[PDB]
Paper text:
[name] crystallized in the C2221 space group with a single monomer in the asymmetric unit. Phase information was obtained by partial substitution of native Ca2+-binding sites in [name] with Tb3+, followed by collection of X-ray diffraction datasets at the Tb X-ray absorption peak energy. The structure of [name] was solved to 1.68 Å resolution via a combined MR and single-wavelength anomalous diffraction (SAD) approach, with the MR search model generated from a poly-alanine seven-bladed β-propeller. The modified β-roll structure in [name] contains three vertically aligned Ca2+ ions on one side of the core fold. Also, the loops that connect subsequent blades contain unique blade-bridging Ca2+-binding sites, suggesting a shared role for this divalent metal in structural stabilization of both domains of [name]. Cavity 1 is lined by the top face of the β-propeller domain and the N-terminal domain, forming a solvent-accessible tunnel that is ~18 Å deep and 15 Å wide at its largest point. Although 3 was required for [name] crystallization, we could not model the alkyl resorcinol substrate in the resulting structure. Notably, the apo [name] model also contained a positive Fo−Fc electron density peak at the Br1 site. Given the presence of chloride salts in the protein storage buffer, we modeled this site as a chloride ion in the apo model. However, the closest Ca2+ ion is approximately 8 Å from this pocket.
Numbering used by the authors: 7 to 45, 49 to 392, 413 to 662
Amino acid sequence: TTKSLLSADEKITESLRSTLSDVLPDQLQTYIRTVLQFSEGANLLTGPNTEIEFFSQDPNKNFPNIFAKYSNVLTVSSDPNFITSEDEEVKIIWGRHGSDSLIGFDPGADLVGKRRIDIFLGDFIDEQFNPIPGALNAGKSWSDRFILGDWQKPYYFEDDETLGLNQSAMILDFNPNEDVIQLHGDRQDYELVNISLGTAIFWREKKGYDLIGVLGGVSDLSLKGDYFEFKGNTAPKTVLKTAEHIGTAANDYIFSSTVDAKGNFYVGGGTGGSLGGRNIGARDAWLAKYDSNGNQRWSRQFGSTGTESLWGMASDGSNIYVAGNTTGQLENNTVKGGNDAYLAKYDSDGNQVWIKQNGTYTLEESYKITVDSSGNIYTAGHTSTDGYVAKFDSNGNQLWVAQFGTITLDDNWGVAADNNGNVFAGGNTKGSFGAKNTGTAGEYDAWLVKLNKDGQTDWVRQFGTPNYDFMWDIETDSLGDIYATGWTLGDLGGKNAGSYDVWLAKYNTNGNQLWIKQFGTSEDDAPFLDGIDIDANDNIFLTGNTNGNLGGANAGSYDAWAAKFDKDGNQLWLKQFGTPDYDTATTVTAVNFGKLYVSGITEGSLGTTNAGSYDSWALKLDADNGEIQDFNS
Ligand SMILES: [Ca+2]
Ligand SMILES: [Ca+2]
Ligand SMILES: [Ca+2]
Ligand SMILES: [Ca+2]
Ligand SMILES: [Ca+2]
Ligand SMILES: [Ca+2]
Ligand SMILES: [Ca+2]
Ligand SMILES: [Ca+2]
Ligand SMILES: [Ca+2]
Ligand SMILES: [Ca+2]
Ligand SMILES: [Ca+2]
Ligand SMILES: [Cl-]
Ligand SMILES: [Mg+2]
Ligand SMILES: [Mg+2]
């Protein structure tokens, strides 16, 4: 009846207004009210109008620090939400450019009775906010996928006698001509309701209704549309039974890998579940050790009630150093800043020997670590954002920190030591750091820096197209030359095949650019995270994702790929592997006896049946030809 639909509208409005107004800080409420006033839904946010601050001496009172706590801001790439964590009641998940795979909910977390609203911006690209005209990417949009369930269960589902308004998605830029909403089960399990805000997606069974999502500003949709993807209620069929499978009912990620001098292989990343130990809260960091024959020796999980990940790991040959960021307190003499870099040392028996956290209110991210042949440790990251490199000794004493960059945004996506006391860093900049940027609207270029043993700058170099270029990872070869891998939307190493393409750049120790190779399909091709490794014979290995037919026929959605190059940039092989669902590689580690490990993440069943949402996997390849071996061979 009319009065049932009117009651639903009222109860949805009142519930969202209550949750949003109680959870979002006043400064964020004020910004969102002003946008909505330009474009009535300002009435969901009842907080007082508050001056928005950028120049407080207290980083915490500044809009960027407040915004960071309630946001996942992804990249110009086609991203999975690799920073998802159940640490806030309300979160803004912002895909930016690229065909993003957006999740905010962890179906393996204990969320009983908790309020959860995830606000999704599929695109909302930088150029929509930037008033300068004629940007290359002005008015561009991508096919985003909003994940509101999987094969296991619907997300935001309270399964109770209420309308289920305590947990819901809110998607603000859904375009039914382009985007996809992913749901548990099949279309007969849902009802769409026209509401003031746009469209309500209700789960419906005999027992009752539960609000799963609200689609802002869109009406008169159908559950028969191509823009709804239904996952059913059974785990996908297992492929690649040769892989090592790592998964809980929660979101589980491998982000990095390494090897020790005995051939033991290590993996690590973040989990929303109890993977290496009992979950401490939200996402935790984890790592695991395998012997040279594929046998798991131990797993460790550490963290806070906040969010942390292992983003990088490296070995001095016996110990394993791990790095990342935390929103909590990992070191018990540290005053946490809520967004801090950490470094820790594990022994080969899985004892956390020490941990160091940079407790400052300054926002800090750190994705990269390396160890030199003297056993000193280098981390890199960013804190406008500026890059840094930090050097530590094996007892975790800081030897120096180098900070550098431009007046605009610089990020770090690489650190690598040579044999000779020098360290390289690399990353992305909107500015003119080592060259004048050809982008007319602050599109990223790639940069490289060489620091000496004292942390002084030997040189800076910059390369790019006028479009976005994005570096993900760097590594040195045995001669001390520096290699970088990334994606480009332009013609960097050659004519762009379409959309994102892969590049591999080499510089010598003196800063001369030797070559840039580019390869790809007409579709999206990119390395990702820990995307380059170089073995003792100076063979280069690259890894990432593609939604094209890059190494082979595409299995479905994005797949993983791996490639081998020689030190002159000749392609020796390129292999593609995956499931019918979303997959990406995240890391590659060469070992010896011609063995290579590629590891990553998946929404499908890779190695064994999917345990829930994201699972992880590790694949052993033959380095001669890319052929997949049994992990246990
Ligand atoms: Ca993106
Ligand atoms: Ca997007
Ligand atoms: Ca989109
Ligand atoms: Ca709900
Ligand atoms: Ca945690
Ligand atoms: Ca901090
Ligand atoms: Ca800067
Ligand atoms: Ca560029
Ligand atoms: Ca391409
Ligand atoms: Ca796939
Ligand atoms: Ca999982
Ligand atoms: Cl970015
Ligand atoms: Mg955040
Ligand atoms: Mg690497």
